[PDB]
Amino acid sequence: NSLEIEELARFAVDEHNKKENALLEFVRVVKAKEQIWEMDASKETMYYLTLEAKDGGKKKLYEAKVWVKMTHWIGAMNNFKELQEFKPV
Amino acid sequence: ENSLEIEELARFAVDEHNKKENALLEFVRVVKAKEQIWEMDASKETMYYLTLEAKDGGKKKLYEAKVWVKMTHWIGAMNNFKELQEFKPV
Amino acid sequence: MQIFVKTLTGKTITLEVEPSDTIENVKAKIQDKEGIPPDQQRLIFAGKQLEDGRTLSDYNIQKESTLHLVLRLR
Amino acid sequence: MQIFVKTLTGKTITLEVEPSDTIENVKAKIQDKEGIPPDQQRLIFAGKQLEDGRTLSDYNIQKESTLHLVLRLR
């Protein structure tokens, strides 16, 4: 779980890096809260991650928002995740 | 050696087979594993050919599973889709 | 009653329906709202694909139920 | 030239196109081929969403290139 969040946090940083050519080092997760919607055949989660990353070797704080939808039916399951927001404090 | 992911795929094949037939096969191990991969832009499509060992009535037997996995990635987004396509005894 | 339809990325639309309605008729409702032809529509509920000739009540699709839609491209 | 369009589940259609063609024109090709309206079409290539005004050559979409399609519901 903490590790699962860590992957999402890294995902947010690596994807952020790709979009801006930004050079962020990932340091740790500071806070993590989630909103989940449960329905038939799916679980939707919005992750509100505050992670710490180094910009110039000096640690700084960033707000990431990752959207994850998992959908499953007989014989099949789908996992989709998306970075929706990445901003400094 | 990338084995745990195969084990998960094998289990997925077993539980989905079970869900579809209400059969309760108990997963023991992966015996053989071969896959076909197609590489394209922003995606990797893989067909898994798994030979697994399962207990039907407490007696272990061999089954052939086929799992289809498509991974699609773009900036800011990632998708993972998998499907059980075949589950048959030898 | 009201039901929801979602894509795998989480895009959501809402339809006003009756339990008497067929799956065939719901796909027509989706086409009218969104423009996606029914031959392109694979509808999912209760871990199953829904048959066109069948109705909503057959699948026990009550109010506030969520269906998911997958593109067929065929 | 020939290119591929795929859904996230792996459903595939083929279009005959030219590098001169716009993304707008491809969505029309898809609409004519599949019946899915262009306002519902989000086309992905080279880790990006494709804008209607740009051409295939702008995005370096050569022969046998594969695009991906996501439903907008909008």
Residue numbers in the entry:
A (entry chain B): 33 to 121
B (entry chain D): 32 to 121
C (entry chain C), D (entry chain A): 1 to 74
Sentences copied from the publication:
In the K33 affimer, the mode of dimerization is different. Both variable loops extend the existing β strands, which leads to the formation of an intermolecular β sheet. Ub interactions are mediated by the elongated β sheet and are centered on W105 that contacts the I44 patch. Additionally, E76 forms a salt bridge with K6 of Ub. The structure also indicates how the affimer could bind to longer K33 polymers. Interestingly, whereas the affimer-bound K6 diUb does not resemble previous K6 crystal structures (Hospenthal et al., 2013, Virdee et al., 2010), the affimer-bound K33 diUb superimposes well with reported K33 diUb crystal structures (Kristariyanto et al., 2015, Michel et al., 2015). The latter also closely resembles a conformation adopted by K11 diUb (Bremm et al., 2010, Matsumoto et al., 2010), suggesting that the K33 affimer could be cross-specific with K11 polyUb. ITC measurements indeed confirm that the K33 affimer also dimerizes to bind K11 diUb tightly, with affinities slightly weaker than the K33 diUb but still in the low nM range. In contrast, the K33/K11 affimer is monomeric and only dimerizes upon diUb binding.
Ub can be ubiquitinated at any of eight primary amines (on the N-terminal amino group of M1 or the side chains of K6, K11, K27, K29, K33, K48, and K63), and all eight Ub linkage types co-exist in cells (Peng et al., 2003). Affimers are 12-kDa non-antibody scaffolds based on the cystatin fold (Tiede et al., 2014, Tiede et al., 2017), in which randomization of surface loops enables the generation of large (1010) libraries, against which epitopes can be screened and binders can be selected. To understand the observed linkage specificities, we determined crystal structures of the K6 and K33 affimers bound to their cognate diUb at 2.5 Å and 2.8 Å resolution, respectively. Both complexes show a conceptually similar interaction between affimers and diUb: each affimer molecule binds one Ub molecule and the affimer dimerizes to bind the two Ub moieties of a diUb in a linkage-specific manner. The variable loops are responsible for dimerization as well as Ub recognition, and specific dimerization provides two binding sites for Ub I44 patches with a defined distance and relative orientation, leading to specific, high-affinity recognition.
